[PDB]
Write a protein that binds this ligand. Structure first.
Ligand SMILES: O=P(O)(O)O[C@H]1[C@@H](OP(=O)(O)O)[C@@H](OP(=O)(O)O)[C@@H](OP(=O)(O)O)[C@@H](OP(=O)(O)O)[C@H]1OP(=O)(O)O
Ligand SMILES: O=P(O)(O)O[C@H]1[C@@H](OP(=O)(O)O)[C@@H](OP(=O)(O)O)[C@@H](OP(=O)(O)O)[C@@H](OP(=O)(O)O)[C@H]1OP(=O)(O)O
Ligand SMILES: [Zn+2]
Ligand SMILES: [Zn+2]
Lengths: 382, 436
RNA sequence: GCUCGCGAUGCUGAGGGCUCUGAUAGCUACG
RNA sequence: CGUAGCUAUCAGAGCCCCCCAGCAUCGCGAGC
C-alpha cells in the first residue's frame, strides 16, 4: 500500500540517521532538513534498504567556487542525497565488474540495448523531511491546513515558474527574462550566485533521470519511483512541481520519459526544528563507515578537504569504471578529451533529454534554466 | 593569529576604534594601534579583521613580515625597480585614490559614493612616494547598451571604472600638453619636454600607476581565490563578467594588456608624444600574481617586431595590505569620473553612455578629439610625430598614427598566434564623424 | 479568471554591532 | 595543588541594526 510505503521509508531514513549520530546525540545530529534515498527489491519491508542520508539547507558562497571541481555547490539535503546515490551507483558498477561470482550481487545486469540497466523490481525512493524549495514549497511553506482552500489561484503566472536560490538573500526567485547568463568573472566580483531551486532539480531528474550525464554513458536512465515528504506536503503544489507543469514535453530520446512517481506525505508529520540553521551538511552512502561533514558555505569539509561528493571525486569514480568497461559495452561511443565538461558532452542522448527539458519550461512560459559558468567544469584530473 | 602575537609580545596594548564608512554591508571599520611609539592602522569589514590588519602592519614594521600566504599575494617587480619597495607604493596609491574619492563625495556621504568597483591613476616624480599626486578617480561596472550607441562619438562605449580612469588620464595629458604650449614660462611646469626623436616625451622619472578595487574582468579574474588559458574575453552587457571570444566590448584584462604594448595614450595622442606605459598595476582585491601576470603580459610574450619606441611593458603587480571584501548584490548603473583640475565629479549612466540629463561626457570620443584638434592647431607641423595634414574625420586622424597602428596589429597577431582568439573591433563607421 | 499599479498585514539566505555560556590554545599574577 | 586575570580560535544562546526579492492574504485603482 502507498501510505505504508511512505511511513516505511520515513522511518528507515530516520533510524539510519540515528545509528550514525549515536541516537541523535552527536554534535552533527543538529539539522534543519533531513533527506535520503532507500532501495526496495520486493514488496516485503525486509527487502527495503537505506542507500543514503543527508542534511543541509545552504549553498556555496560565491567566492569559494572551485575551478577544479573540489567544492560542493549546493548542500540542500536532497541535492546531497542524490550525489550519495551516485556513489552507490559507481560502487554497484565496480561490483559487477570483479568476476562472474560477484556480479550476481550487483543491482545492474547487462542490458539488451547496450550497456547496463537495473535488474527488475529494484526501485529507488526519495525522502525529504520538508517540501523542496521553489515551486512545491514557496506558495505554502507551512503545515497543510485541515480545512483546505487548495491554492485558490492555480492560474497565476507565478505557478510552475522556474526559480533559483539566490546568494545571501531570501526567497527562491523566478528566472528573469532580462537578466541572463552567469559568469565566473561576475560572481567573484559580486554578482550573486544563482542556483536552480530543488523543486526544479527534482523535476529535471523526473526527465533526464537521477543518474547524471556521466553515468548515462554506462547506464540506462533511472527514476525515483516515489517522492515522500516528512512535513509540509501539498498534493497539488507537489504534483505541479514534479512533472505536471511540463506535461508539454516532446521528443524525448528513447527510454526517457516524463516520470510521474508516487507522491505522498507521511502519517506523523515531522516537527519544525528550533534554532539557527546549521551551516554544515552531512552525507552518508551505504558502504561508508561514518558520515562526512561539509561546510555548505565553502563546499568543503572542516579542514578544507574535498568531499567524496565533489565533481572531482565523481569524475574519479567515473574514470575507474571507464577504465574497465570494454569499448564495445559502452552506451555511447563518442570520444571526448578527458576534461569534466567534455566527457559530459559525450552523453549525446542525455544532453538531448536536457535540451527538451529546458525547452518544455521555456515554451510553457516558466522561464529559461540557469546554468553555472562554463569554467566550473573545464578542469582535468591530469 | 596576528594580534595574538602582538599582544603576547607587547602585552600591554590597546587598540582604539577610529571610524566607520559606507553602509551596513559595504561598511568598513578602521582600527588604529600605537605600539612602541608609532601609529599603525588597518581597515576591514568587521572590527576583528581591521585590528588584525593594523596589528600586522605593526608586526611587519617593529619586527618583520608574517605568514607569506604563498607567492600568490607576493608582488611582481618591474624592470629598474625605483619608487621604493613594492607594497609600500601599492598601499600609498590605494590610500591616495580612496582618500580622494572621499573628498569627491562629501567624505563618502554622496549617493554617487555607492559603487562596486573603484579605480584611479596616480602620478609620481620618482624617488619619494610623499611626492605622489592622484591624477584621476572613477567607478563603474557596465557598458553602453547597443540601442544607445552614437554615430558621432557622443556616447561612452565602456564605463568599467578602470577604463574610465584611462580616458581621464588622457584628459590630463591633453591638459599637460596645452600647459607646455601656451607660453614659455608655463612649459616649466608641464610634465612633457621636447624629445630627441620628434614631438614630446615625458620628463625623466615621471610615472603613472593604475589602481583598481578588484582584478580586471576577463582573464586576470578567471581563477578561484581559495585554491591558465590566457584567452580573450568580451563583456556581455545584459550582466556582469565575461564570455570567452569565439574562434561587443573587450574585457578590461585584454584592454590593459593592449595598453601594455601600444601604451595608454591611444592613437591620437601618440602623434604628439612617445609611448606611455603604466609602471604599476595595484589591485585592492583578488590579487593573484600568476593570474594577473599572465593576463597582463605573459600570455603574449610571443609578440615581436614592434616599432622603435613600443615594447611589452612588464609593470609592477601588487595587491594591498588591507584588501577589500566582496559585496554580493546588484551593480550600480552609474559611473563616476574625475580628473585633477576638475571642480566636481561627472556622473554617467553606463547603459546610455551619457550623463544624468542626457549630455555627452567630457570623456566621450567627440570631446577628446575636440581637445586633440585644439592642440593640433597649436603645435607646429614640423614638431608632429606623424604628419597629419588637414585633420577632419576622426578615424583618419587616428590612422595617421602609423607607428601606433603597427603596434596594434602586432598585438592582434600575437594573440591569434598564441591561440587566444582574435580581437573584436567595433564597426569602423562609429568613428566616421567630424567636429562639424 | 488573469495582468499592471499603489497601499496594508504577514511569510521565507546574507552582513554588522553589543552581551551570556562552553571547550581548545598561548601568556601572566597570586597563595 | 589551586584560583583569579589577559589576548587568539571554534560551537551554542540572547538582543539590536541593516539588507535581500520573491510569495500569501486583503483593500483601492486600472487594463485584458
Ligand atoms: O546540483 P547538482 O546535484 O550539483 O548538479 C550539478 C550541477 O548543478 P549545480 O551547478 O546547481 O550544482 C550542474 O548544473 P548547471 O549549474 O550546469 O545547470 C550540472 O548540469 P550541467 O550538465 O549543466 O553541468 C550537473 O548535472 P549533470 O549530471 O546532468 O551534468 C551537476 O552534476 P555534477 O555535480 O556532477 O556537475
Ligand atoms: O573605450 P576605450 O576602451 O577607452 O577604447 C576605445 C575603443 O574601445 P571600445 O570600442 O571598446 O570603447 C576602440 O576599440 P575598438 O572597439 O574599435 O577595438 C578604439 O580602437 P580602434 O579605434 O583602434 O578600433 C579606440 O582605441 P584607440 O583610440 O587607441 O585606437 C578607443 O579609444 P577612442 O574611444 O579614443 O577611440
Ligand atoms: Zn532546496
Ligand atoms: Zn572590466
Amino acid at each position: 500500500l502507498p501510505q505504508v510505503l511512505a511511513d516505511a521509508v520515513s522511518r528507515l531514513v530516520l533510524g539510519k540517521f540515528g545509528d550514525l549520530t549515536d541516537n541523535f546525540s552527536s554534535p552533527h545530529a543538529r539539522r534543519k532538513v533531513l533527506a535520503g534515498v532507500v532501495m526496495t527489491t520486493g514488496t516485503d519491508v525486509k527487502d527495503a534498504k537505506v542507500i543514503s542520508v543527508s542534511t543541509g539547507t545552504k549553498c556555496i558562497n560565491g567566492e569559494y567556487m572551485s575551478d577544479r571541481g573540489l567544492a560542493l555547490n549546493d548542500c540542500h539535503a536532497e541535492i546531497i542525497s542524490r550525489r550519495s546515490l551516485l556513489r552507490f551507483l559507481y560502487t554497484q558498477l565496480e561490483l559487477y565488474l570483479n568476476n562472474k561470482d560477484d556480479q550476481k550481487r550487483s543491482i545492474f545486469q547487462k542490458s539488451e540495448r547496450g550497456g547496463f540497466r537495473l535488474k527488475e523490481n529494484v526501485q529507488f525512493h526519495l525522502y525529504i523531511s520538508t517540501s523542496p524549495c521553489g515551486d512545491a514549497r514557496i506558495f505554502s511553506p507551512h503545515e497543510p491546513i485541515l480545512e483546505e482552500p487548495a491554492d485558490r489561484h492555480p492560474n497565476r503566472k507565478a505557478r510552475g515558474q522556474l526559480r533559483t536560490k539566490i546568494e545571501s538573500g531570501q526567497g527562491t526567485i523566478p528566472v528573469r527574462s532580462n537578466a541572463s547568463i552567469q559568469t565566473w568573472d561576475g560572481v567573484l566580483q559580486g554578482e550573486r550566485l544563482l542556483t536552480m531551486s530543488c523543486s526544479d532539480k527534482i523535476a529535471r531528474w523526473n526527465v533526464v533521470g537521477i543518474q547524471g550525464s556521466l553515468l548515462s554513458i554506462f547506464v540506462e536512465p533511472i527514476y525515483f519511483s516515489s517522492i515522500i515528504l516528512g512535513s509540509l506536503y501539498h498534493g497539488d503544489h507537489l504534483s505541479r512541481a514534479m512533472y505536471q507543469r511540463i506535461s508539454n514535453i516532446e521528443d524525448l530520446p528513447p527510454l526517457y520519459t516524463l516520470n510521474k512517481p508516487l507522491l505522498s506525505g507521511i502519517s506523523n508529520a515531522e516537527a519544525r526544528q528550533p534554532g539557527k540553521a546549521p551551516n554544515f551538511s552531512v552525507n552518508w552512502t551505504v558502504g561508508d563507515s561514518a558520515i562526512e561533514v561539509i561546510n555548505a558555505t565553502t563546499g568543503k569539509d572542516e579542514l578544507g578537504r574535498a568531499s567524496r561528493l565533489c565533481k572531482h571525486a565523481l569524475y574519479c569514480r567515473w574514470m575507474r569504471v571507464h577504465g574497465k568497461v570494454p569499448s564495445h559495452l559502452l552506451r555511447s561511443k563518442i570520444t571526448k578529451p578527458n576534461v569534466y565538461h567534455e566527457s559530459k558532452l559525450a552523453a549525446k542522448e542525455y544532453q538531448a533529454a536536457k535540451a527538451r527539458l529546458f525547452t518544455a519550461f521555456i515554451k510553457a512560459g516558466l522561464g529559461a534554466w540557469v546554468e553555472k559558468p562554463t569554467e566550473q567544469d573545464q578542469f582535468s584530473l591530469t
